[PDB]
Symmetry: D2
Subunit: 502 residues, 4 copies
């Protein structure tokens, strides 16, 4: 007997036990006489079109692949639940938080950002940590990262950032000129680059990392009073990281290290959990916060904004079929039940558009009817009809226009959004030159010890050495602005690497 992942098929055979083999059928349920040989004109003659068994099977095989996710392509999934452990009903009317001990089913997908489908798990990258909550007020998708921040603060740059992080358009190779030209020109990236190149850039599987909502959200209570919040989900298995050397070894030996680790943990009963916290900031505190509190390159310091415990995420179930439950899952940040709303974080606003949009491409217009995406603890009743691969009854003969005088679904006034006044011109405002160094300096100095600063600078120099000198110089300039020692230590290591380079 091996690890549970290696025994997948043996275990499936054993559950079947004395049951006779099912009859092998075509797509349309017609029994198949022989699926080992094709129909031919005698033993050395050509193939006949009336071999429809062959064509049915081959045509399906031809269309097995769907587009990979534009980002976060390489993933591992699991199911379990969220349990409420404290009352936060003062902050939010959301039914997910309604009373202590209320259990909500969840789906999670862990992912890297830049690697395509086949790529190694144990590489330096931000990790996605997406959580779908199947609530009675429909699904809530909290589509998180393993970092509280991101590289950019304006959503128009996200395609550019991803292009720089992927392959050269001509050579189809990873290109450090591209990666570091983009970062050196966008120094709002310094904060997330510092975290990325620290130890937690390569977690030891998905079980040993935190997740964050990263954005500011707005919570609204039953009285219509609003606060801003951050979501944090801190690992109960404890933070653990791979060394660069072990990460490299695993990249070759086990490209799917993350998938295997998580599948095995759940199959052997070692159920990974995370404690779900909020930080809360009031609307008055948001006016007086030294930075933009909706700036995705900034954290809220813990002293001023302590973590308020809410609940626990537990993963206790493996996906039965990976394609059905993990390839096809779709998380939309716009799927927010009443009591949770978008802040004016520019980056979050961009994400409200982008995700349904890509889901309709990658999966299809009716992707929300795919069972993993279905809000199966709500009744969906609306005026949407038709579209390819329309499943169930398409809401039967119900009137398909609103308003109507025929008792078809009605809007629910309690579900109406929180109202705010905003001051200023409707125009494009420049954020680039915000305050991109202050909190990065706090991280370098007050969070990292001396050993960690040394590895941070060795990890940066090891990547940045492959850029052209003019890029290296602009990169080092930005690191210098964070802290003289940060810049100088990077420059020192680059001088060594550029001298060894013939």
């Amino acid at each position: 007997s091996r690890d549970p992942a290696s025994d997948q098929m043996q275990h499936w055979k054993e559950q079947r036990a004395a049951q006779k083999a099912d009859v092998l059928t075509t797509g349309a349920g017609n029994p198949v006489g022989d699926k080992l040989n094709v129909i031919t004109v005698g033993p050395r003659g050509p193939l006949l079109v009336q071999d429809v068994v062959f064509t049915d099977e081959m045509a399906h095989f031809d269309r097995e692949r769907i587009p990979e996710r534009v980002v976060h392509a390489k993933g591992a999934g699991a199911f379990g639940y969220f349990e409420v452990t404290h009352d936060i009903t003062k902050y939010s009317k959301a039914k997910v938080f309604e009373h202590i001990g209320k259990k909500t089913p969840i789906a999670v997908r862990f992912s890297t950002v830049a690697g395509e489908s086949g790529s190694a798990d144990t590489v330096r990258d931000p990790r996605g940590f997406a959580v779908k909550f199947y609530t009675e007020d429909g699904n809530w998708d909290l589509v998180g990262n393993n970092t509280p921040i991101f590289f950019i603060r304006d959503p128009i740059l996200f395609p550019s950032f991803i292009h720089s992080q992927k392959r050269n358009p001509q050579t189809h190779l990873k290109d450090p000129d591209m990666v570091w030209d983009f970062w050196s020109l966008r120094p709002e990236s310094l904060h997330q680059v510092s975290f990325l190149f620290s130890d937690r850039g390569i977690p030891d599987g998905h079980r040993h990392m935190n997740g964050y909502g990263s954005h500011t959200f707005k919570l609204v209570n039953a009285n219509g009073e609003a606060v801003y919040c951050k979501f944090h989900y801190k690992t109960d298995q404890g933070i653990k990281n791979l060394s660069v050397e072990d990460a490299a070894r695993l990249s070759q030996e086990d490209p799917d290290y993350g998938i295997r680790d998580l599948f095995n943990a759940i199959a052997t009963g070692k159920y990974p959990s995370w404690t779900f916290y909020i930080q809360v900031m009031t609307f008055n505190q948001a006016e007086t916060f030294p930075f933009n509190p909706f700036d995705l390159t900034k954290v809220w310091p813990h002293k001023d904004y302590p973590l308020i415990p809410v609940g626990k995420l537990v993963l206790n179930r493996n996906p039965v079929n990976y394609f059905a439950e993990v390839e096809q899952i779709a998380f939309d940040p716009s799927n927010m039940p009443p009591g949770i709303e978008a802040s004016p974080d520019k980056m979050l606003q961009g994400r409200l558009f982008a995700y349904p949009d890509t889901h309709r491409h990658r999966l299809g217009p009716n992707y929300l009817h795919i069972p993993v995406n279905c809000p199966y603890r709500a009744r969906v009743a609306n005026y949407q009809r038709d579209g390819p691969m329309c499943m169930q009854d398409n809401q039967g003969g119900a009137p398909n226009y609103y308003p109507n005088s025929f008792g078809a679904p009605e809007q629910q006034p309690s579900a109406l959004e929180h109202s705010i006044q905003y001051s200023g011109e409707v125009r494009r405002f420049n954020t680039a030159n915000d305050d991109n160094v202050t909190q990065v300096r706090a991280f370098y100095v007050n969070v990292l010890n001396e050993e960690q600063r040394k590895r941070l600078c060795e990890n940066i120099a090891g990547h940045l050495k492959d850029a052209q000198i003019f890029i290296q110089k602009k990169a080092v300039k930005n690191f210098t602005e964070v802290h003289p020692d940060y810049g100088s230590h990077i420059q020192a290591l680059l001088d060594k690497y550029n001298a060894e380079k013939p």
Copy 2:
């Protein structure tokens, strides 16, 4: 109170009765506060992206349309059952025919050929009569016409024939030059052109027409003995046709006459039925038949091949949602359970390829999981996986390769096809100059009376008058070959029409 079709919504309201209106939700089940107004910056300001209710709804609306069927676009559907009334188990082992009184659920779609989605029902055209039988040996699709024959005997010409029957590629108009140039050059069309331009070219709705399989099929019994057959399903409501004048009036007043007539009949309990017959021909009779018995331009005369009664089709149920059940239905002639097989009819062989192929385009690779297409009285178990819009469980964790040593589905030797030896070179054989007049002459002379011959010639001349003279001459030449009176009477009427034309 009006006809049942006009009272669709009132009846739906009444069934709901005292029930409170459902809550109006987004696609993801989140309740909607207000779906009458969009979120704006003050009363005369611009629209916000965080209006996701608006974007969810609009984006769905944008993708409501799917490709129309390449042919047979305009359709009406119904459900009911097939009941066996006689034993034909001597001819076929098919479970659909297994014992007297065995009921099988059916789905039917009636259609014209050339009209696009919006077009009028009451036009001169062949009518489709497609029947899906949901058997325990999977679905059987008998994809029939309202005529026993077709215009062509080789499947390579089918796209050409349809192009000639549709719109000019530049003008986007119906083009009689195109229609009649194609027919005048392909005189195998004479038989189906004669039927088309007779009275039964415009049936009085779908209830007053026969359906035919048209092709020769091969029936195989439990001993492995094969016969050839034709399927006929003769209307129990009796044949009835619209006059050209009434057809024209209805085309303007009620473009959806066929849909309305059938929906109303079923809603008022007047359940239309058809008696299902076979003609049988043995393999020896097929050797000695004066024509090719697999020639789709030929009938089997009733004296030599009498109709053997089998069962009854009854339509007793309206579709609940037209898009779900009629737009999305897909019939594949290749879906044949054991005991029914393809003959070597060249046209049928072509159809075994074409239909799954177009279904994967029009609907999607997993179109057989759409509930109307699902073989819900069989267990589907196979090695097909994934593909966009994968529904249910994708067969769970079952081994996905065959052969395997893990008890995954097994081929069933009893379902193996009937074996035949064929003599000759593998090459392209010319059929054009077969015997394209003999059975047409039998129809003109022995089936039609004098009144019917006169209308046939008036109906042809009325269409053919719009072709160029050289086309008219080649058309009349082919009609002359059927019978001198056929050609002469057409020429006479054309001379009148061409003189009135300035």
Copy 3:
């Protein structure tokens, strides 16, 4: 010799003249030996898969259809040019208007709203009049109607409105209960319903109707000063309408009357033109306008806002292939060159999202590379890459991220949009009960004469008679509010029709 439309193929043959027939090829350019017969095992044997000529052709035929447009499905197209005839450079910096005599190529598509692909042209409906201007500042799409107004003033209701105007979801029939329930509940529709049921509801082909932008747009001049405007394009062939009786006759005799009329006019040199006008309103006038000047249910009265002449549209070219140039054309109201901008018309704002969104579905992500959609008088240079059916060079090896230090395209500050301040809360504002009768009354009383009022009431009653009584009563109530005579005359005719109804 017939009309030019009827002689399409003869003319094509004649242009070819002495040229030998091209060689018939597969999709991949391989010459075809015989495309009249399929490869079979002897003359009465089955079809072989190695007949790839057959499968290549059939598979293409299977995928000929694309989704029809969700609205405006049935269309006729033409090409020509726009010529500037007056200086409006004081109002707009747009290069389309740059100097007198400047010619810009155009594409136009005329359409009904509700009819599907096959449907009759000569029916009562609003007509689309879409104009694509191929300018040197890229394409400008002015996607107009044959009416200055529309039925609704908030874009969230557009899917609902279209559903009510199309087929019942169960019966698949047109449903007057649906049509009039929606209008009776949304009395902002009264203005467009009055125009629709007047004489200009059924124009005599596309040449005898006006087009309007309908929305308020914002013009910006080279000094950065903004005005609001309306676009009007008035027919130079003069307004002409079909009677209800002639419309009905043509619906049966010539379903494609509009397509034929326009194709023939252009082929015989009778080039239809429209005079292109603007109305201008200043930002101060917009503050003091008695209604919302961005309300799509309102006109700007001509006395207060006179038509300023700008140029002339001339259509002088037929599409060479209808599918290439008319089915595949895509117009995006968001395609506005510098100097033309969106107003805060809520309906226009909705349209900025919806059209690219549906185009990516109907045509594909790279639909702007389809030659009719290509901005062929601009160089397209951007950071967009890949996507299915990527044509040309995908911008070669150019850096694909922005900002970059490698001389890839740069933003152009002169193209930056006009800035405005807006006052108010970000919330959903109710518009329903605006002023929905005042301008309708002006139309009924001051524009229509007595004969026209009588036909208006006969046309309404003739449609509305088929609704249930409670709907009829709410409809008449809203007409009464416009004018007592309007309501009373409709009620009188309904009493007659409801008495004749058994």
Copy 4:
């Protein structure tokens, strides 16, 4: 200065030189004022829908990914030419071979089989070597492997084989139980498994490997006389292989080793070439060949069937954009000009169906209009029309039906295929138990030396150790049948590995 691949962007900048930066535009060519910041209601307010620059860019980014190839996903491409160096016109009338010195442009894609898009190049796998020849008789696609044989001899098993070679459906991991269960049950795999696990299983980049057509093809000369042939294209850079240890190191250090190696070779002028040979067998020799000569698990021994030189493939051009030219390229084995035909190799027959079928999914129905797929040295003239993303003119107003009397393209009798008679029943014939060991034994004994046999057995045992014991036993049984030493040496190493396993 680095390798040319690393200097891609610097070289692109330098070619541009003094040229001013292009203007950054939308998709529709409208100039962009600012693409660094989004439009917001004041500096901390929400995002507006009228930011169409943002939505245009984001929506495109959302749809960048297309489905990866179902097999051979990970690829490197290049262009160059084929030159004829000897006369083979006695064997084939194909215009590619027409006279000595005739140059034909080519496109090549090298690939692994099982790895997805992101995966490492330097892994043990068969390599694809696909060649598209752009001839004047259209494109010829010779879609080859780096081995003369394959694992299976019947095309119905190809989906099963690929499933076993890819990821477990539940765990999404590579599964040795799956790999070796399939091979141990299908011992026709022994020949290709022996080659795969020898040294040439991991070539040193794409330049140091042979390509083979693998199938028997049929050549037809101008007199209509047919022979059978194999195509071989032997590397002129010489065979060179990576050790298992170096392959593992490169898999981690340079996942894209193959892409980089080939791009650099071509950019530095070191143009890789292959000598193109045929083996010829006459129809009489095919009757007397000891095996099935159309059996894809068999070679033709070189003594009996010597290599006849034909020409040279030279690769001298890098793709300008990888997505345009390598992701979107499509090779169809069915694209054969006159003079080259399919043999009755069952596996080739299957491939005639599968490839166009998958191309229409992965790329689109009009994928042959993508410039890399376009047969640009032939005029394509046919009756195919429409389909999504129809480019060029859709063949203008040419008649779209055949036959016609309007001078539209005509079939070319010289292009008609070679005719053969075949003897036997049309049924499913069992091939499994053919002669699966004889030629494998010849390879083990006569081709491999002692060192190579030892590595072969170490390479097999190193993979097969991870299977369950019952699979290991059935695998070893099949290896024993090839040669007692083959089986015994594998069993010995497995006993060592299974003892170390706790």
